[PDB]
């Protein structure tokens, strides 16, 4: 008997539709509130979130839907453009989605009448992950079950294609490096590509398979974190191709891994969606056990707030937020 005291979510917001993915804007939108996107069965909702921890005028959470986009298909992944700004004389909302129809859609909006989307075709399998290039915002990387990593301009033209040895499961741009791309493969291989040389720089191998998610630490560009099988795995580059840490994350497989955007020692993992509840575990590298354990009904997405030690997971028709101490 240790009653796993599953912590309640710090905040909970009701949604009009099922949440299948959720992503905070990791960029500065120039607004006081953090931009959040969530994808449902046929819609993408863009919202502003303000928290009492960043703004003493808010009691708890202020959640405001800014815009709802008709998407027509189930959204699987969302990526923010670094050009997204709401405080400008001309606000620009730009994000990309991957969906159940194997297409990418780039949405561009002024929050007024100008609402345009571009459809990008070329993936022959499901797209598992997609990301904008952070610093230029001009390019989108995507990975999928067609065993390709593809690079697109905003015009939907394929600039580059890398053939993978298995399904691509996650993709991340180097936080400081416009031409460095991490691609994580389902067989446990994580590869780094240079887009100027079109070459693989280096690879990492997971001690478990399948690898389901990987993330590049923004606060420490030497750290890579992933989930594979039941474990979370951390590497510190360039010191070794072997993992520095490998520890149990979840009993019934780990699904998502994300680094905190404010702390290089904090990350969250999600369990595979069981029939009733997904477990969420917040970890700190100085501790052998999770510092927080939460639960969501059918956990979908995992994202971190830009400034606060606050993570979000979608579940059923709700967003669940967990704040951790720093």
């Amino acid at each position: 008997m240790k009653q796993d005291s599953a912590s309640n979510a710090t905040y909970t917001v009701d949604c009009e539709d099922y949440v299948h993915v959720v992503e905070f804007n990791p960029f500065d939108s120039g607004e006081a509130g953090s931009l959040l996107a969530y994808g449902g069965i046929s819609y993408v909702v863009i919202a502003s979130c303000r928290f009492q921890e960043e703004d003493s005028t808010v009691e708890g959470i202020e959640f405001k839907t800014l815009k709802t986009f008709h998407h027509g298909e189930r959204v699987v992944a969302i990526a923010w453009s670094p050009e997204t700004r709401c405080d400008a004389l001309l606000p620009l909302l730009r994000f990309a989605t991957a969906a159940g129809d194997k297409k990418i859609r780039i949405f561009t909006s002024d929050f007024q009448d100008k609402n345009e989307y571009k459809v990008i075709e070329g993936h022959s399998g499901y797209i598992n992950d997609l990301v904008f290039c952070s610093p230029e915002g001009t390019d989108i990387a995507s990975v999928g079950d067609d065993h390709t990593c593809r690079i697109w301009d905003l015009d939907g033209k394929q600039i580059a294609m890398f053939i993978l040895r298995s399904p691509g499961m996650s993709v991340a741009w180097h936080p400081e490096g416009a031409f460095k791309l991490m691609v994580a493969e389902k067989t446990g291989t994580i590869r780094f590509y240079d887009l100027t040389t079109h070459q693989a720089i280096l690879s990492l191998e997971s001690v478990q398979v399948p690898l389901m998610s990987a993330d590049w630490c923004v606060r420490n560009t030497l750290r890579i974190g992933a989930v594979a099988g039941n474990d979370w795995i951390i590497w510190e580059m360039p010191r070794s191709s072997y993992p520095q840490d490998n520890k149990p994350a979840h009993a019934d497989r780990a699904r998502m891994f994300r680094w905190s955007k404010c702390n290089e020692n904090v990350f969250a993992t999600t369990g595979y969606p069981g029939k009733m509840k997904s477990q969420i575990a917040i970890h700190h590298l100085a501790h052998p056990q999770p510092i927080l354990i939460g639960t969501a009904p059918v956990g979908s997405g995992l994202s971190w707030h830009r400034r606060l030690p606050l993570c979000v997971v979608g579940g059923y028709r709700k967003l669940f937020f967990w704040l951790t101490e720093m």
Partner: protein
Amino acid sequence: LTRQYSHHSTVGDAVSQLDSQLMDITKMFGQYADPFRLSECKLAIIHCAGHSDPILVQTLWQDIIDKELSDSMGNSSVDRMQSLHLKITSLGKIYASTPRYFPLEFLVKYLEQQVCNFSWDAGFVTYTMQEINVPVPKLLEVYDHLFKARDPWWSRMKKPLHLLESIYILLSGYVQEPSKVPSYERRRFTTLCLDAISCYLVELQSMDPAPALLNTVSNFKSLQAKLERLS
């Protein structure tokens, strides 16, 4: 407006309009308090309206402090310190009962940054907050938080011991006059001070040995031995 803007061509018309009728708070804010940058009047307006924006409240307190520091630029360092003290005490006595309009942690942090910038007495902020009737235990909680936050600002200013000097002055004042803390909480508060001083002494031992650091360690050991006589 009559006192600070007497030379401005629009103030005669503004004053006559303010006599001619009672105005709504919204009109007072947008037509008079905002155009004339009246941060004290803006603070009174949002207090009266029950409108609570913590960022706006901090900005208004900053503008009040910065204006008082600007208006006093021709005066001696002591007169500038006294002018700001009288200003902050006068407004603090109005708003300190309502924590939504008195952002104590921001005010302590910001005033301690000004004490460092002007090379004023480290006692200034601790004295001013006590004269507002800020409870000594609540003021210690704020200083303990500011110290534990490890703000790189203090090291950049070459004043890494400043918050510990302010804590030493605050706690030395409590040891001299234990009646500043209500009798029912005094024992609990003295224990909290002994635990906090023990933490500060461990952190001071982790820093490079400088003459100023050795003096701070001596001061905290002397303070510990005085608090053990009060427990």
